[PDB]
Amino acid sequence: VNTNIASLNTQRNLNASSNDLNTSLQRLTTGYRINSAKDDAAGLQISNR
Amino acid sequence: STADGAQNAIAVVDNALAAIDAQRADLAAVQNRFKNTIDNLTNISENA
Amino acid sequence: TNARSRIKDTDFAAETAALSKNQVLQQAGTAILAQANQLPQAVLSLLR
Amino acid sequence: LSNQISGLNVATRNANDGISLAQTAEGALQQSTNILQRIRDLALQSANGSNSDADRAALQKEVAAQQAELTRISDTTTFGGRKLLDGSFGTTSFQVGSNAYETIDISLQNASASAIGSYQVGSNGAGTVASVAGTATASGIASGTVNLVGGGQVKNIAIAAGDSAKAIAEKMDGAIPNLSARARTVFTADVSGVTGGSLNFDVTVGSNTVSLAGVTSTQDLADQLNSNSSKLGITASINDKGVLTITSATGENVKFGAQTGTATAGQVAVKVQGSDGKFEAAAKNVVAAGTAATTTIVTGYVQLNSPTAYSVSGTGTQASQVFGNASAAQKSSVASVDI
Amino acid sequence: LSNQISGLNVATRNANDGISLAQTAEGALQQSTNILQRIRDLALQSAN
Amino acid sequence: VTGGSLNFDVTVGSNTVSLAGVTSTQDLADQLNSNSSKLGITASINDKG
Amino acid sequence: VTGGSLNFDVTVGSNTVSLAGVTSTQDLADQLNSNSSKLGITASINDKG
């Protein structure tokens, strides 16, 4: 097994964890669990109203 | 200016933000669909 | 405003823990990568 | 021996191809699980407090986009242009031995799509219309020995003449594996004009009996129910429209007693909620000033959610008096799911 | 399989581009939502 | 469309619903977009209407 | 199949079971596949049912 390595699941999990980390960092630096972004559009409408 | 505006503008902004948040919810849908499809896509490419 | 706080402002008491978990998981992933990217090198250098 | 080793080597290679194909399918199924759990989040958030989230259209759009993404996950799995989990899968069988017809079968799912394999539904108005179960009537729930089918565990549920929807649900529950049964009686009311007097009638909800009096408008009966909320465990609701709405979490077969009023003309029409939905348009009164009216009781509906396959039948009235002329749990209806 | 994985990678990159586009759109729409907030503010101030 | 609505049935293979309130091009677009999930359609209105 | 169940006995060599609740092509398939191990047979439903 040398033309490729099956460890690319690690890259997949790393990308997923990095996106989750950016979301958590944004939520922390903004203080809003429901960010002004797309997340929880229903809660977004409730917050807007 | 005097009478109508004070309330007509509310009549505007209510449905205005309603439509804006409708578009924001459509964007939320397409982006969540994008996250799901890109995760599926990485997984199926890795299995392939 | 109490409703808006209940719906918007994060209860970060668990968000900090989630952030620490994400950080240690990322570091663990980099460690797994550093260990796994070295297996084919070893198997080729020792089998050849 | 050379024949044997060659056959075993090529069989090992075919099995490697097969296990890789199976991992592709497993990843597709994992993604469908993620989509379904996200749908569950959006559905329980879709509770909206039942009146608070004015963006119900955008929420249905969100759920519809998630459904379209699920149907796309069904596709795009073309491991060789032969998409596995959706469409028409040939139910292949990988040969793993050095002998003829020595193979290992696989029974991949037909589709992650609509009713083609989502949870089958046994409902009241499923076929055309619903009998006594889920509508008003005079006599009430009659006798019967409705037959149940599924998992080789046929069980003739005995439904006596008079059993409320709650009792019927509790009865059909249990024996049949992975089947559940809820009870629900949702009925509205609308008092008509009262010529010279009011409607002094009664309401027997199960054991206890209401002794209300002086009904001239829907609002009067509304207050009478809201006050009697202690005794009768059935919440009432009158919106700005004018249609008083009464719902029972349990599912008791509400009955309206005799109309011993003092008026001369008038009636109180009621409707009953259907199984799937589409609240009844055709009205029918339970009490009427003057001549005695018909359909004096109100019987709720039940719903038999079924994961894979669950058939039900009944001799004549028995089948109708539960789920009408259904005889099949078909029309899983995950596509038509609304929010 | 090579055709498939190449198509999957380019689809991944196109999906990332689409995610970025939709996120820019979401930022623009939340900005417009803040503008509508300020417009209702000034409108109810116009009661005066 | 004059003097009433053009309410019509939309039959697509197995699943079938019936739209109502048809009075303009955008009206269709919208309601079909609402029912696209059930009917299995892709209702897309372009910039040219 | 009308008015009742098609409960019937399944004899396979030595082991013998008696199926019940079968009312459709899918039903019999599922019930047989459930007991496929005991009977030592291969009950498989195809795409065409």
Author numbering:
A (entry chain e): 5 to 53
B (entry chain f): 393 to 440
C (entry chain e): 441 to 488
D (entry chain c): 54 to 392
E (entry chain f): 54 to 101
F (entry chain g), G (entry chain d): 247 to 295
Direct quotes from the study:
We used the same method here to reconstruct the PAO1 flagellar filament to 5 Å resolution. Using the composite flagellin model, we built a model of the full PAO1 flagellar filament and then fit it into the density map. Due to not imposing helical symmetry on our reconstruction there, we observed an inherent curvature in the density map, arising from the supercoiling of the filaments, which was preserved in the refined model we built. Between conformations 1 and 2, domains D2 differ from each other by a displacement of about 4–6 Å and domains D3 differed by about 8–15 Å. This unique protofilament constitutes a seam or discontinuity in the helical symmetry of the outer domains. The seam is generated by the two conformations 1 and 2 alternating along the 5-start helix. The conformational states adopted by the PAO1 B type flagellin result in the formation of a rigid flagellar filament structure with a seam on the outer curve of its supercoiled structure.
Flagellar filaments can be neatly divided structurally into the two highly conserved inner domains, D0 and D1, which form the inner core of the filament, and a diverse number of outer domains, which decorate the inner core. Here we show that in the Pseudomonas aeruginosa PAO1 strain, a bacterium that forms a ridged filament with a dimerization of its flagellin outer domains, motility is categorically dependent on these flagellin outer domains. Moreover, a comprehensive network of intermolecular interactions connecting the inner domains to the outer domains, the outer domains to one another, and the outer domains back to the inner domain filament core, is required for motility.
